[PDB]
Amino acid sequence: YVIGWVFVWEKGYQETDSVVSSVTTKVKGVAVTRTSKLGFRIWDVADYVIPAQEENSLFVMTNVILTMNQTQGLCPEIPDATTVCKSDASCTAGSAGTHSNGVSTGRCVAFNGSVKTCEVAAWCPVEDDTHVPQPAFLKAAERFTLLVKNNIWYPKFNFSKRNILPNITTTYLKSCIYDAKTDPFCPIFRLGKIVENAGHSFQDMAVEGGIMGIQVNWDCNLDRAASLCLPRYSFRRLDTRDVEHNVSPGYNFRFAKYYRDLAGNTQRTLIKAYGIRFDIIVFGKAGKFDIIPTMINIGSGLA
Amino acid sequence: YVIGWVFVWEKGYQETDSVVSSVTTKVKGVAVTRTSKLGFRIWDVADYVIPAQEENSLFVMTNVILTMNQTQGLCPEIPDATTVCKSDASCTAGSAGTHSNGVSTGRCVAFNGSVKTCEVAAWCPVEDDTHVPQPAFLKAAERFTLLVKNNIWYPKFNFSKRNILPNITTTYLKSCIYDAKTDPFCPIFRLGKIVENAGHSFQDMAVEGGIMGIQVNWDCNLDRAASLCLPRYSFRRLDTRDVEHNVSPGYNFRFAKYYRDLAGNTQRTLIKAYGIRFDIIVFGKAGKFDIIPTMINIGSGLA
Amino acid sequence: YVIGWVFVWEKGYQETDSVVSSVTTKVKGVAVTRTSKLGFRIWDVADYVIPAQEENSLFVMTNVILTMNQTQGLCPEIPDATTVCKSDASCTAGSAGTHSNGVSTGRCVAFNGSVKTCEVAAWCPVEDDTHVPQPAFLKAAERFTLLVKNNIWYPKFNFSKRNILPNITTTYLKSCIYDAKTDPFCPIFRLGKIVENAGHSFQDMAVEGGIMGIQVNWDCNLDRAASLCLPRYSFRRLDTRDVEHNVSPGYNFRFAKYYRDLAGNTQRTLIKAYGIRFDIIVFGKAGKFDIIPTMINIGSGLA
Ligand SMILES: Nc1c(C(=O)O)cc(Nc2ccc(Nc3ccccc3)c(C(=O)O)c2)c2c1C(=O)c1ccccc1C2=O
Ligand SMILES: Nc1c(C(=O)O)cc(Nc2ccc(Nc3ccccc3)c(C(=O)O)c2)c2c1C(=O)c1ccccc1C2=O
Ligand SMILES: Nc1c(C(=O)O)cc(Nc2ccc(Nc3ccccc3)c(C(=O)O)c2)c2c1C(=O)c1ccccc1C2=O
Ligand SMILES: *[C@@H]1O[C@H](CO)[C@@H](O[C@@H]2O[C@H](CO)[C@@H](O)[C@H](O)[C@H]2NC(C)=O)[C@H](O)[C@H]1NC(C)=O
Ligand SMILES: *[C@@H]1O[C@H](CO)[C@@H](O[C@@H]2O[C@H](CO)[C@@H](O)[C@H](O)[C@H]2NC(C)=O)[C@H](O)[C@H]1NC(C)=O
Ligand SMILES: *[C@@H]1O[C@H](CO)[C@@H](O[C@@H]2O[C@H](CO)[C@@H](O)[C@H](O)[C@H]2NC(C)=O)[C@H](O)[C@H]1NC(C)=O
Ligand SMILES: *[C@@H]1O[C@H](CO)[C@@H](O)[C@H](O)[C@H]1NC(C)=O
Ligand SMILES: *[C@@H]1O[C@H](CO)[C@@H](O)[C@H](O)[C@H]1NC(C)=O
Ligand SMILES: *[C@@H]1O[C@H](CO)[C@@H](O)[C@H](O)[C@H]1NC(C)=O
């Protein structure tokens, strides 16, 4: 038993290589407030997915903080301890610490509540993120569906395969949603269910944003059949909620847009967009018997 | 013969590792209609490539469907069987299926031709994609040229190399275009020829969009010379045309832009951009003799 | 000694696999000119980082060439030797070479200095890049800081780890900046220091743009402790300055924006943005003892 079995279980036979992959992704679903005889911006795939595509990944804008009607000028910093001031002292004029968004004048200017903060020359008013809004603005996004289409290639063979298996069909695929118990190959996932299979609740993760991984895992013993090489799915949170132990901000990005009247009087407005980012983290290795390399590997065992 | 030859052919000697890579890409070429004394938007690299860069990849906008002059409001759905209606029945008021772009009122509203469809509260009018325009709008894109610049690094060595080989020169590189028979190292490819070397015709693939892979393949026996480690090129289609057997849509994306008068009356306009996406799918393994690890590997053979 | 030691040093024991990774990046810092009682656009993270995110990578806009107030029409080509003309000859009417941005009329039109160039139908005036401005416009970017947050996963284990090590804390992390001699684990790098650790000077590399790699390298003997698996950092230039020996342009991209009056009279303006691109090139392999696969590998040694 021993000698044959150990090589046969271990697979020193089968020649193996790691997988070359390509991906495309779409989100589908709509969100709204009010109805007929009324107006409120209805949300679709052309709004909430920006940027429209990324390599192996996509974003969903779950919650938004709005910075409005800016010009460049003079205003107070936000009340945070590292430059809350009784009077000017460490806030050196003509200097700007790496946390900041503007340059000191040397003045501890008055500000409401806590009675003063250090001044900055900056875009004004400053960005305030002291209270990330709750509930998360795009609360309806839990129900949206992500389509993950993936093609795998093995350079050690003429082989390739598409994650939409060769027996899935139109009238099913227009309404299937993935479930590991009943539909192990439908390429469509429901965003709330991506996060729930990772053990987190989308109700909360949507507030401050985060990063989410669809681990499309490929592993094939290519000896059997092309009909029998198959994908398996798993889901992982990739940020972490270790606050005060710290991690810098929960995942977000801070794009802006900018405008003028005909007379040229500039403004920016800035969106601190909090969201969940979905990374389609494909990985695989696959093996095929192949006698030539096997004879060497098993040859060490044959001695 | 046997014992030495099998190890010598197989390369249990040579120590090997898989490649760390970076890429940059530009497209060059122009497209037009009309001439002097006339006006029609002339197309260049600043228009047709959007988004301007992506990781290991780029897009070319071959064909465009235009959704115009929108507001949020009340309008019919497109005539497709899953909600063509004789009268209201399954189209439940206050509900929206995952195919859709708006919410039911419960009314099977009249619409022209096929006499009715279910209503949605939505962006209106709805997106129509029942007839992807032919010939493809940017027909001239077949002649455009993509420059692929790639640098490879092997962490098991101090080694790196640039795919623009160390003997290519200015006056050649300003006009070379790749051909596997005569110019195996020119970094410039012609888009129509990328697709033709994959066996497809750009004349048709430009209509409904798709995904295309430049497999820049590196494989070196580093023992020989740095002058003799070299890239090899190959081209693969990565989407598939298995319609009715289905694949969801052919590759496209659906960005939009949005506007107001000074009085604030909003619009969007939405581009369903169909195109070819080019993925610069670099992969390599390379090997160098190295006596220390060889002595172990060949040691199993020496027994 | 020999038999045990060679297997024990070489690590045919320990089972090993290559790493699955995710990344997020932010830049922080500000740049300015003039002060109070004066106006000049102040620069922050919402301006200079565009595009707002990319997979494993980010851009910093170090230097900008401006193409202004365009319409489509008739104008001369830039004075470059491959179509500087004494009179019309090779510049065939209705043809456009792959270097160009417009189509020949067959006329060698007059132009100032060198007295003529071939005409193009084009966007006009043409893009001029004959003198990349010096010093680089965003000179202050040397002082900006990039935060690199990286999570690693090993599919051969339940294992994962975050590059912000489990003993880094808030009040340090709000002001640490990386240095291989004193702070080997702070996730924040200073852009000028990224380039200086690669041996180049940011003072010059900022002029014509280029590509820069933060090689976050993971290598763990997982036997020891999760507390003792640790990242190591290194920095590499990935473009090259081999001019005249050539490389096509130094790294840049050429986005544009476009506008109309209410009457619809179109313009574009085009930014040839030169910058440094930062690629967070994570790679790792890690090994853990594991007796089952070891017994096979060492079994060849035991014979
Ligand atoms: N320009 C803008 C502007 C603006 O300038 O008004 C406002 C924006 N939000 C927004 C948020 C709430 C809104 N109302 C509202 C909601 C609840 C109760 C009562 C009233 C309304 C609106 O009433 O329209 C508009 C955005 C952008 C973007 O540009 C933008 C770009 C990309 C993604 C998202 C956005 C975005 O959210
Ligand atoms: N805003 C717009 C607008 C608009 O608002 O008019 C129109 C657009 N197309 C378009 C198409 C055809 C056009 N004429 C035409 C062609 C044949 C025969 C007769 C007449 C004309 C035009 O005559 O100018 C314009 C686009 C955008 C984008 O924003 C845009 C953004 C990114 C990529 C592409 C586009 C785009 O194609
Ligand atoms: N639209 C624009 C426009 C415009 O239309 O005026 C001008 C732009 N530059 C710019 C450069 C210099 C400026 N002054 C100045 C500097 C030194 C001495 C004296 C005067 C001023 C300004 O005075 O404001 C403005 C940009 C954009 C973008 O759209 C843009 C988009 C993304 C990144 C960068 C840019 C950008 O640099
Ligand atoms: C496509 O055909 C295959 C045939 O094997 C179906 O396979 C499923 O395989 C998993 C194990 O990998 C089983 O747990 C399931 O029970 C199988 N399905 C069924 C219906 O028994 C696959 O399901 C087929 N595709 C569809 C859409 O059913
Ligand atoms: C750069 O130098 C090399 C020297 O080997 C040229 O190599 C070509 O190599 C392939 C095989 O890999 C041969 O089929 C070609 O015939 C070789 N070229 C020639 C001209 O014979 C390479 O072509 C050189 N670069 C250029 C631009 O010619
Ligand atoms: C977190 O704890 C570790 C404990 O090992 C600190 O480890 C540093 O490890 C390197 C070698 O990898 C040594 O050269 C350093 O001297 C160690 N640091 C010190 C302070 O001695 C690590 O530095 C700790 N984190 C912080 C922020 O200090
Ligand atoms: C900006 O805010 C002011 C009031 O603070 C308002 O008058 C102005 O119209 C706003 N700008 C725009 C473009 O809405
Ligand atoms: C939108 O269409 C209407 C006619 O349906 C037209 O009057 C209006 O000017 C259009 N809007 C714009 C901004 O062109
Ligand atoms: C474009 O330039 C002309 C002068 O050449 C100027 O009159 C016009 O106002 C400029 N356009 C804009 C929108 O500034």
For atom 2 of ligand 1, which residue has the closest CA?
Answer: A269
Binding residues of B for CTP: 26, 28, 145, 252, 254, 272
* Determination approach: cryo-EM
| Cα–Cα separations (whole angstroms), residue A39 to A210, A252, B219 | 31, 29, 61
The two three-digit tokens of residue B176, written as one number: 């070379």
Query: Counting one residue from A and one from C, how many pairs have CB atoms under 8 Å apart?
Result: 111
Whether C104 is covered by a domain: the verdict is yes
Whether B189 is covered by a domain: the verdict is yes
Q: Are B75 and B67 in contact (CB under 8 A)?
A: no
The two three-digit tokens of residue C249, written as one number: 């342009």
Q: Does C4 touch chain A (CB under 8 A)?
A: no
- Please tell me the distance from the alpha carbon of residue C199 to that of residue C217, in angstroms, as a whole number: 19
Query: In chain B, whose CA is at the least distance from the CA of C303?
Result: B303
Closest Cα in chain C, distance from residue A175 (Å)? 30
Which residue in A56, A105, A246 is closest to C36 by CB distance? A105
Which of B32, A114, A227 lies closest to C95, judged by CA?
Answer: B32
8 Å CB contact of C72 and B39: yes
Helical segments of B234-275, H only: none
Instruction: Spell out which residues of chain A touch residue C188, defining contact as CB-CB under 8 Å.
Output: 98
Which of A140, A174, A142 lies closest to B98, judged by CA?
Answer: A174
Which of A303, B286, B197, B129 lies closest to C303, judged by CA?
Answer: A303
- Please tell me the distance from the alpha carbon of residue C172 to that of residue B100, in angstroms, as a whole number: 50
Window A:150-169, CB contacts with B under 8 Å: 151, 153, 155, 162, 164, 168-169
Whether B84 is covered by a domain: the verdict is yes
**Which amino acids bring their CB within 6 angstroms of ligand 4?**
A 165, 167-168, 172, 184-185, 230
Pairing mode, strands B267-279 and B252-253: antiparallel
Q: Are A267 and A258 in contact (CB under 8 A)?
A: yes
| Cα–Cα separations (whole angstroms), residue A146 to A226, A273, B77, B98, B175 | 27, 20, 22, 10, 43
Which of C54, C52, C56, C58 lies closest to C20, judged by CA?
Answer: C56
The two three-digit tokens of residue C277, written as one number: 């691109």
- Please tell me the distance from the alpha carbon of residue B280 to that of residue B214, in angstroms, as a whole number: 5
Dihedrals phi, psi of B120, to nearest 5 degrees = -130, 140
The two three-digit tokens of residue B217, written as one number: 């393949």
Whether B23 is covered by a domain: the verdict is yes
Q: Are residues C79 and C43 in the same domain?
A: no
Q: State in Å: Cα C50 to ligand 2 middle.
A: 24
C17 DSSP β-pair partners: C286
Which residue in B26, B40, B55 is closest to C54 by CB distance? B55
For atom 27 of ligand 4, which residue has the closest CA?
Answer: A168
- What sign for the dihedral angle of Cα A71, A75, A77, A83? positive
Q: State in Å: Cα A11 to ligand 5 middle.
A: 41
- Please tell me the distance from the alpha carbon of residue B130 to that of residue B77, in angstroms, as a whole number: 12
Q: Does B103 touch chain A (CB under 8 A)?
A: yes
- Please tell me the distance from the alpha carbon of residue C226 to that of residue C245, in angstroms, as a whole number: 49
8 Å CB contact of B251 and A51: no
Q: Are residues A167 and A154 in the same domain?
A: yes
Which residue in C24, C55, C173 is closest to A55 by CB distance? C55
Q: State in Å: Cα B273 to ligand 1 middle.
A: 24
Q: Does C236 touch chain B (CB under 8 A)?
A: yes
Q: Identify the H or E element spanning B208.
A: helix B202-208
Q: Are residues C60 and C166 in the same domain?
A: yes
- Please tell me the distance from the alpha carbon of residue B276 to that of residue B252, in angstroms, as a whole number: 8
Instruction: Spell out which residues of chain C touch residue B173, defining contact as CB-CB under 8 Å.
Output: 246, 248
Q: Are B185 and B173 in contact (CB under 8 A)?
A: no
Q: Identify the H or E element spanning A62.
A: strand A57-67
A217 DSSP β-pair partners: A232, A283
- Please tell me the distance from the alpha carbon of residue A151 to that of residue B242, in angstroms, as a whole number: 14
Q: How far is CA A40 from the centre of its chain?
A: 27
- To the question of whether residue A156 is assigned a binding role by annotation, the answer is no
8 Å CB contact of A238 and C22: yes
Length of chain B: 303
Instruction: Spell out which residues of chain B touch residue C244, defining contact as CB-CB under 8 Å.
Output: 170
Pairing mode, strands B267-279 and B210-221: parallel
Whether B223 is covered by a domain: the verdict is yes
Which residue in A18, A103, A246 is closest to C170 by CB distance? A246
- Please tell me the distance from the alpha carbon of residue B163 to that of residue B216, in angstroms, as a whole number: 9
Tell me if the bond preceding B249 is cis, omega within 30° of 0. no
Helix and strand numbers (H, E) in chain B are: 6, 16
The two three-digit tokens of residue B75, written as one number: 């309008």
Q: Are residues A52 and A170 in the same domain?
A: yes
Q: Does B302 touch chain C (CB under 8 A)?
A: no
8 Å CB contact of B42 and C6: no
Which amino acid, one-letter code, is at B61?
M
**CB of C270 closer than 6 angstroms to any ligand 3 atom:** no
Q: Which long-range contacts (CB under 8 A, 24 or more apart) does C4-9 make?
A: C6/B295, C6/B296, C6/B299, C6/C301, C7/B296, C7/C297, C7/C298, C7/C301
- What sign for the dihedral angle of Cα C223, C230, C218, C180? negative
- Burial string for B237-266 (b: 16+ CB within 10 Å, else e) reads bbbbeeeeeebbbbbbbbbbeeeeeeeeee
Q: Are residues C197 and C232 in the same domain?
A: yes
Instruction: Spell out which residues of chain B touch residue C72, defining contact as CB-CB under 8 Å.
Output: 39-42
Q: How far is CA C124 from the centre of its chain?
A: 30
Which amino acid, one-letter code, is at C106?
G
Phi-psi region of B34 (alpha: psi -120 to 50; beta: other; left: phi over 0): left
Which of C146, C87, C90, C93 lies closest to C115, judged by CA?
Answer: C87
Which of A102, A1, A92, A60 lies closest to A206, judged by CA?
Answer: A60
Triad C4, C9, C12: Cα angle to 5°: 80
- Please tell me the distance from the alpha carbon of residue C243 to that of residue A268, in angstroms, as a whole number: 40
Resolution of this entry in Å?
Answer: 3.3
Q: Identify the H or E element spanning B207.
A: helix B202-208
Which residue in C45, C151, C300 is closest to A254 by CB distance? C45
Give the DSSP letter of residue B133: -
Whether B98 is covered by a domain: the verdict is yes
Q: Are residues B221 and B289 in the same domain?
A: yes
Q: Are A203 and A143 in contact (CB under 8 A)?
A: no
Calculate helix-pair angle for C291-302, A2-10, nearest 10 degrees. 130
Start-to-end Cα distance in chain A: 16
SS3 B45: helix
Q: What is the 3-state secondary structure (H, E, C) of chain C?
A: CHHHHHHHHHCCCCEEEECEEEEEEEEECCECCCCCCCCCCCECHHHHCCCCCECCEEEEEEEEEEECCCEEEEEECCCCHHHECCCCCCCCCCCCCCCCCEECCCCEEECCCCCEEEEEEEEECCCCCCCCCCCCCCHHHHHCEEEEEEEEECCCCCCEEECCCCCCCHHHHCCCCCECCCECCCCEEEHHHHHHHCCCCHHHHHHHCEEEEEEEEEEEECCCCHHHCCEEEEEEECCCCCCCCCCCCCCEECCEEEECCCCCCCEEEEEEEEEEEEECCCEEEEEECCHHHHHHHHHHHHC
Q: Identify the H or E element spanning A152.
A: strand A145-153
Helix-strand-coil split of chain A, %, nearest 5: 20, 35, 45
Q: Are residues B42 and B145 in the same domain?
A: yes
Q: State in Å: Cα A194 to ligand 8 middle.
A: 42
Whether B85 is covered by a domain: the verdict is yes
Q: Are residues C288 and C199 in the same domain?
A: yes
**CB of B165 closer than 6 angstroms to any ligand 5 atom:** yes
| Cα–Cα separations (whole angstroms), residue B169 to B164, B174, B230, C224 | 9, 9, 16, 52
- Please tell me the distance from the alpha carbon of residue B288 to that of residue C248, in angstroms, as a whole number: 31
- Please tell me the distance from the alpha carbon of residue C268 to that of residue C124, in angstroms, as a whole number: 10
Q: Are C189 and C214 in contact (CB under 8 A)?
A: yes
Q: Are residues B237 and B288 in the same domain?
A: yes
Dihedrals phi, psi of A112, to nearest 5 degrees = -70, 155
DSSP letters spanning A225-293: -GGG--EEEEEEE-S----SS--SSPSEE--EEEE--TT---EEEEEEEEEEEEE---EEEEEE--HHH
Q: Are residues B93 and B226 in the same domain?
A: no
Which of C297, C289, C294 lies closest to B299, judged by CA?
Answer: C297
- What sign for the dihedral angle of Cα C166, C172, C177, C179? negative
**CB of C41 closer than 6 angstroms to any ligand 3 atom:** yes
Q: Are C178 and C190 in contact (CB under 8 A)?
A: yes
- Please tell me the distance from the alpha carbon of residue A153 to that of residue B217, in angstroms, as a whole number: 13
**CB of B184 closer than 6 angstroms to any ligand 5 atom:** yes
8 Å CB contact of B174 and C82: yes
- Please tell me the distance from the alpha carbon of residue C7 to that of residue B288, in angstroms, as a whole number: 21
**CA atoms lying within 13 Å on the CB side of residue A123:** 25
Pairing mode, strands B210-221 and B283-288: parallel
Q: Are residues A194 and A239 in the same domain?
A: yes
8 Å CB contact of C295 and A51: no
**CB of A257 closer than 6 angstroms to any ligand 1 atom:** yes
Q: Are A270 and A70 in contact (CB under 8 A)?
A: yes
Q: Are residues A91 and A215 in the same domain?
A: no
- Please tell me the distance from the alpha carbon of residue B36 to that of residue C124, in angstroms, as a whole number: 13
- CATH, residue B174: 2.60.490.10
* Domain total in chain C: 2
From C162, C163, C164, C165, mutation site for ligand 6 pocket: most ligand atoms within 8 A of C-beta: C165
8 Å CB contact of A103 and C32: yes
Whether A268 is covered by a domain: the verdict is no
Dihedrals phi, psi of B225, to nearest 5 degrees = -160, 145
Query: In which domain, by residue range, is A81 found?
Result: 71-124
- Please tell me the distance from the alpha carbon of residue B196 to that of residue B189, in angstroms, as a whole number: 11
Last residue of a domain, one of A124, A145, A162: A124
- Burial string for A251-286 (b: 16+ CB within 10 Å, else e) reads bbbbbbeeeeeeeeeeebebbbbbbbbbbbbbbbeb
Q: Does C261 touch chain B (CB under 8 A)?
A: no
Burial, C219: exposed, middle or buried (Cβ in 10 Å; 0-12, 13-18, 19+)? middle
Triad B133, B136, B142: Cα angle to 5°: 170
Cβ partners under 8 Å of residue B224, min gap 6: none
- To the question of whether residue C138 is assigned a binding role by annotation, the answer is no
